[model samples]
Each structure stands twice: as C-alpha cells, then as structure tokens.
Target: MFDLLLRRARLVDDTLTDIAIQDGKIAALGEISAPSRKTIDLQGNSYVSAGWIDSHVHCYPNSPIYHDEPDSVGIATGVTTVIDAGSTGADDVDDFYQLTRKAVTEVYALLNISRVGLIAQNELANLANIDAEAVKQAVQRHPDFIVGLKARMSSSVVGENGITPLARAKTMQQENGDLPLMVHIGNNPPNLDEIAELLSRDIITHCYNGKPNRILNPAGELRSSITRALHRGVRLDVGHGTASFSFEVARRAIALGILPHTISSDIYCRNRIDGPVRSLALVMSKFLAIGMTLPQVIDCVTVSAAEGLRLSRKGRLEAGFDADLTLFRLERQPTLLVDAEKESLQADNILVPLAAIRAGKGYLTEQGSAEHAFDF
Candidate 1:
C-alpha cells in the first residue's frame, strides 16, 4: 500500500489526476488505484504543483546579520526547500547544517567564497579570508549539503576589491566540480558589464534591483552585455530582499522579454517579519500582477529553479521523484502588492497557498489551517 494518496488533484495545467506516494517518493500518478494508508481528496478544485523552492535565503540561526529559522521562512510559508545563500562559509557551514537537521524544511547552502562568510558585510574586502583549500575541504566534507557556491559581487560586500573576488570565485568553481555559482548584484564598482562578461551558466540574483548598475541601461533598454550573458546560459533570479527589488525595473525587463528564470525571496529574520520581502508566495504574487501567467509563475519556482540549482529529483511531478508538492488556489480578491521600492499595485487575483507536502507528509500553512483545505 502507498503511504499517502491525493485524489482528484488539480494540476497547474488544470488537469485532474491522483498522486500516490510511497517511501517519500512519488510512486504513481494519473489515476492511482492502489490502497493507501492515508488519503485526501481535493475534489478537483485546488491546485497542486511541485513544492516551491526558494533559491536565495538566509536561514542560519547563528548568523548575526541575516538570520532566520528554516521553517519560519520555509515550510511554514508553503516552501518545501530553501537554499541559504552565503549565510555561512567553511567556518560555520557545519553548524548550519546541524541546526537544520531538526527543521522540517529541506535546507541546502551555497558556500560563500570567503571563509568568514557573512559575519560582516564586507566579507570579501580582505582577500586573506578567501581560503580556496578550506572551501574545497568543506565541500568535500558535506557534498550534499553544500549545493553550490556564492559570491556577493556588490560594492558593500566587496568593498574596494572590484572584480578580483569574482575571478577567484571562478577559479574555485573549476576546482570544485564547476558547481553552479550564484552572484549578487547591487551598487557596483566592478560594473554590471564587467560582471556579465565573465558569467556563463551562472546565476545573477537580484536582477531587477533599482541601482545605477542594474541590468537595464539608462535608456531603459536591456544591456547588450546582459543579453550576451543570457545567450551564453547565464540565468537571472529575483532575490527580492529589503533593498534589491524594484517594480519599475521588473516591469520594464519583463516587457522587454528579459524574464527571470527563478523568482526567490532573499528573506531573513528582518525582512520576513517586516515589510516588503515577506515570503516567497508574496514575491510570486507580485510577478502575477506584473502579467506573468499562472503556469509561467509556477515554472520559475519549480522546474526552472531546480534546473538552475541542479536538483535532479525535486522539480517535476513525475513518478520516481521526490514526493514534494504545494497545494494552493488562485483567489479572486482585491489585494495590494508592494516591492522593495515601496511602490504599490492593485491585483485582482492572488496566489493563496494552503499547504505543503514534503517527503509524503503535509503541513498546513496559516491560510490552509484556517480554510481546512485538506481532510486526512
């Protein structure tokens, strides 16, 4: 018998099917007939898709600056997995891994190139902190926990070191199996053009920030260097932190067909509890307001995010993959969405997340609990 079965579930494409889970993996789909230990019938109304994955977040509780418990920004808000982006490096990654063991949310990290990690904002300012050997050893120690590498190539994080830190990051990438590298963009001394030239199959987070060094030129058109990078397999991500996202930039970029491959909330304790960057669901809603369709928005958080991070078994809804799913609905309610720039927009439809099922077990979100969407 299967561990669990969800009957008459509506997929993102609006097709109805039954999904069966066994031993934490999807066992069957498309009209399941076998018996299950537990079952929930959706009645072919609520939507089910692969569980949401936030590509950039900071959840290491020990981190002084950007810190939050994994579940607070994760399964509690219908996100099944989260990648803590450079909250810790070799110095504290082990502890970060240990802390996440007790959390229900699956946690992975992109190791910071600097050994000091985010202990200070200027982790890359001092070149001596970048110990390539230490980073390699850490990756070897926790091969699965350390998914990729991170280098915040911004003015505040890099200090006076312009493009030198990113060059070292490229070298480290080659040494460490050439794993995916996620680079943060903001106020720049190294300029977006210089950064874009060196990227191929790398990720540029906070792609639509309203900084002088944003992806668009002063003329409000997509830059040629960024276009070249996109053609060369460089992906864009919306790391909507307290100071990174701008509605104007995102609107102009999307209108110009410069869509982000991944939509992520750069959430931590401060942003999660405060205004603007509250949760991944909210960030997804803003994109819907910006004219992205339901399927398009879901793909960015699911398949596209998995492909970018190389999570082989976590994206699709096919059998033999991880049994991680998100259940939600598109409610027609008047709502106001805000971005990091404090600009507002009215949306007629909003994504309302009900529950998240990870590893064949389900947890109710606040709205889900209130609505009693699932009956076991």
Candidate 2:
C-alpha cells in the first residue's frame, strides 16, 4: 500500500495523472488502482511539478552580510530544495551545514573560494582568504552538503585581485573532483570576457544584469565572449537578486535564444521582504511575461536547475525520485512585475504557490490555506 496518493493532478503541460508516494519516494505515476493510507485529490485544479529548486540564494543565518533562515527561503515559499550560493565559505560552512539540519527545506551550499565567506562583501579582497587547503578540508568534511565551488569575480568583491581569485577557483574545482563551479558576475574590472575565457561547464549567475558589465554589448547583442562561453558549455543562472536582474537584458537574451538554465531568487531577508526578487515564483512569472511558455518557465527551475547543479534525482516527476512537489495555480490577474533595474511590466498572469510536499509530507502555504487548496 502507498503511504499517500494524489489524484487528478494537472501538470504544467495540462495533462492529468495520479501519483503515489511511499517511503519518501515516488512509488507510482499515471493510473493507480491501489489503496493508500491517505489521499488528496487535486481535482485537476492545480499544477504540480517535481519540486522547485532555487540554485542561487543566501540563507545562512549567521552570515553578517547576507543571512536568512532556510525554511523562510525554502518550503514556506514552495521551494523544496534551496542551494545556498556562497553565503558561507570554508570557515563558516560547517556552521551553515549544522544549522540547516534543523530545517525542513533541503539545503545545499556552494562553498565560497574565500575562507572567510560572506563575513563582508569583499571576501575575496584578501588573497590569503582564498585558502586552497581550507577549501579541500571543507569539501572533504561535507562531501554531500557542499555541492559546488563559488567564486565572486567582480571589482568590489575581488578588489585588486582582478582575475586571480577565479584562476584559483578553477584550480580548486579540478582539485575537488571537478565539481561544478558557480561564478557571480557583477561590476567588472577583470572584464567579463576575461572571466568567461577561463570557465568551462561552470555556472554564471546574474547572467542578465542591466549593469554595464552585462553579457550584452553596447549594440544590445550577445557579447562574443559570452557567446564563446556558451559554446564551451557554460550554464547561465538567473540569480535575480536586488540588482542582478534586468527586464531589458532578459527579454533580449531570450529573444536571441539565450535562455537561463536556472531561474533563482537571490532571496534573503532583505530581498524577500523588499521590492524585486520577491520570490522564485515571481522571477519565473517575469519570464512568462517576457515571452517564455509555461512549460519553458517551469523547466528552468526544475530539470534545468537540477542538471546544472547535478542534483540528479531532484528535478523530475518520475518513480524512484524524491517525493517532492509544488502545487500552484496560474491566476490571470493584472499585476505589475518589477525587476532589479526598477523596470516594470504589466502582466496578466502570475503563479501563486499554494502548497509544497517534501518527502511525501505535505504543508500548506499561507495562500494555500486561505484558498483552501487541499481541504484534506
């Protein structure tokens, strides 16, 4: 017998199916003619996906710079898994990992190249903080929790280091079994071209910032450097933080077939409560307004995100994968979606996350409870 069953669930593609869960894993899909301890009938009213994964976020509660509780940025917001992007480095990752153990949200970290980690914005400013030995020790300690390596390659963060920190990051990546690397791009003195030349199969967060250092050139076309980076198999993640996302850049990039691999909210206490980067759902909604289909937007946060982070079993709605799901509805309400660049777009439809199911246990979101999404 299944532990729980969901009936008449609608997928993003508008197909209806039944799902069964047991032992915290998906037991079955399609038509199910079996018994279960409990069942919730979605009644084909809400859309369900494997789970939402925010590949770039800051949720380390102890970090002085950017910090937030994992659950606040995770399950409560319909995100089953959140990859904390370099909020902690070698020195503090242990603390970040231990704290996340008490959270219901599946938490993972991208170890910062700096040993200090977000103690200050200019973590990479000191070359000594980029301790290769410390990074190796931290990765060895939490092989599972540390998903990848992160390097912030920009002027303010790197200071006078220029491209040296990134060069060290590349060496560290190879030293640590060639794990995926996530690079945060911002105001550049090292130049994006110089950074892109050194990346291969790494992740470029903040891919569509409106800042002068964006992937687009003065003529509004993809930079030859970035184009070359893409051809070399680098992935783009939409780390829609306080100042990293621009509607103009995203629109043009999507028009040119340069789509983001993952749509993430660089969500923390400030961005979550303030305007713009409200949530990953809002980020996904903006993409919908920008011209991506529902299916396309969903893929960015699901399978595409999983592939980039190498979370093999966390992205698909198949039997044997983790029993994680997000139940939400598309509301055709007139809303003004804003971006980090203070630009706004009037959109007719928005995604409202109602509930989340992680490891076969269900929880209702505030909106879910108010709307009576699942009376069961």
Candidate 3:
C-alpha cells in the first residue's frame, strides 16, 4: 500500500498531475485508480514543487534569535533544508553537530572561520584574533556538515584591517582543500574590490546591502571585482536579513540584469516580527513584483540554493528522489511592502503556503501552536 496520495496537484514541470508516495519516495506521477492510506486534493491553483532550501540562516542551539529545532520554522514555511551561515564556528562545532543534526530539520553549516564565531563580544574583523587552525580542525572533524567558510568584512567586523581578513580566509580555504567561502559585504574592511579579488568560488551574502562601500560601484554596475568573482565561479546570495537587503540596490542590480544566484531570509526572532521580507514567500514576491518570472524566482530559492549547498540532487521532484514538496497559492491583488532602509515599495502579488511535505510526511499547524504530522 502507498503511504499517501495527492490528487490533481501542480508538479514542478508545471503540469497538473496526481502523485503517489510510498516508502518515502515518489511512487507515481500520473492518475492512480486505487486509493491509498490517505488522499488530498491540491485544488489545481496551488503549486506542488520542491521544498524550499534556505541557503543562509543562523539558527544555532539556544541562540538569541532562532530556536534549536529550526524544523519548526522549516515545516511552517515549507522550507525543509537550511544552511546555517556561520552561527557556530570552531568553538561550538561539537555541540552544534550533536544537537542541531538530530533536529527535525535537515541542517548544514558554513562554519565561521573565526574561532569565536559571532558571539556577542567580538566579530570576524579582528585580524589579530582569528584562529585559522581551529577552523581547520572543525572542518576536518565534520566534513559532511561544513560546506563552506564564512567571514564578515564590515567595518564593525573587520575593523580597519581591510583585505587582511579575506586574505586569511583565502589561506584557510586553500589549506582546507579550497572549500567555498561566504563573505558578508557592506562596511567591509578590505573594500569591496579587494575582497572580491581574493574570494574564490565564494558567496557574497547581503549582496544588496546598501551602504557606500557595498558591492555596487558608483556607476550602478556591479563592482568590477564582483564581476571577476562571478566569472571565477563565486555565488552571490540575497540574504535578506534586518539590514542586508536594500530595495534600491536590488532594483539597480536587477535593472542591470544582475540577479542573485540565490535568495534567502536571514531570519531569526527579531527580524521575524519586523518583517516585510519575513519569509521566503515575501522574498519571492518582492522579486516577482520587480518583474522576475515565477520559475526564475522559484529556481533561485529552491534548486540553486540546494546545488550551492551540495545537497546531492534533492531539490527537484524527479522520479526516484525524495518526495519533499511545498504547495503555495499565488495571491492576486495582494497589498505588500518591500522594506529597505526607510522606504517601502508596494507590490500586488505574493506567495502563500497552504501545506508542505518533508520526505513524504505532511505538516499541519495553527498559529502559536506546534507543528504536527498529518497523513497528507
């Protein structure tokens, strides 16, 4: 017998079809004459595509913002996998591994190169304080968990040292088999151009952060070094945290035909309440309002993020892969705001999640209540 069957749902290929799940995998993708343990009607308008994979987040165990079990956020919002961007570095890798790995959400890490990570006291820019050896040890110990390295080059983080931090990160990446590095720009030390020079196959988180020293040059084109990094296989991420995503910058980039490789919500407790870009849906909506196609926006949040995290072919609903999916409705005539700095842009469309499935298991929950599994 099959585990569950969803009838008349929109598949990733944009076709309306029925899907059967058995033993946690897609059993069939066409009409099924026989009944299963449970059945659901997806109501044609809603789309059933691959579950969202957020490429940048920072939910560490007992962290100030996100809780230990980030799966709650994941299941609630239709995101099944996430890459915790440098929440815990070398110092707490063991605890992060033991606790976060066992949680319901599938978690990955871009281990912060700083031994202290982003604790309250210090940030990554203190060139005198970075411990490259500790980062190496953590990477070696948890090869599966650590996909890349992270460094913050902001003035607050990097101080006056500038390019030295990127240089250090480059050295660490080279020593650790040339793993990908994720650099947080804006207010950076070594200036955008210099940092872009050293980044080899890295991710520029907060690519739309709107500050004078951010990635875009005065001419409104992407900084020359950023172009160089892109040519060298670096990935640019739209990490829309509290201050990272700026409407002006994103609009300029898009106008110049420089869309981000991935889109993510750097969501945590504080940002969730003060949100216009609170969820992945909002991020998608913002981009859609700015004229990106549904497929283009969805690909940035799903397939591209998954590939960047090295998640081994799990982002698509192809036959023989795990049946992780999310169903969302595109609301018409929606009144939405895209927040950046002090200004907000009005958008007429938004994506809203109706239900989500992780590894073929259905999720259901009411506001302020814990998420529970459903039959489908």
Each prediction's whole-model lDDT (CA): 0.92, 0.92, 0.76
TM-score of 1: 0.98
Query: What tens digits encode model 1's per-residue C-alpha lDDT throughout 1-376?
Result: 9999999999988999999999999999997789999999999879999999999999999999899999999888989999999999999999999999999998999999999999999999999988899999999999999999999998888888899999999999999999899999999788999999989979999999998779999999999999999999999999999999999999999999988899999999998888688889889999999998889999999999999999999978889999989999889899888888899999888888889999999999999989986754
Ten-residue region with minimum lDDT total, candidate 1? 367-376
Per-residue lDDT of model 3, residues 68-106, tens digit only: 357655767777777888877788777888877665567
Q: In lDDT terms, how accurate is model 3?
A: 0.76
Q: What is candidate 1's local distance difference test score?
A: 0.92
> What are the RMSDs of all candidates, in order?
1.0, 0.9, 2.9
Regions of model 2 farther than 4 Å from truth = none
Using lDDT as the measure, name the better of candidate 1 and candidate 3: 1
TM-score of 3: 0.90
- Across 257-285, the per-residue lDDT of candidate 2 in tens digits comes to 99988899888998898859878888999
Better model by TM-score: candidate 1 vs candidate 3: 1
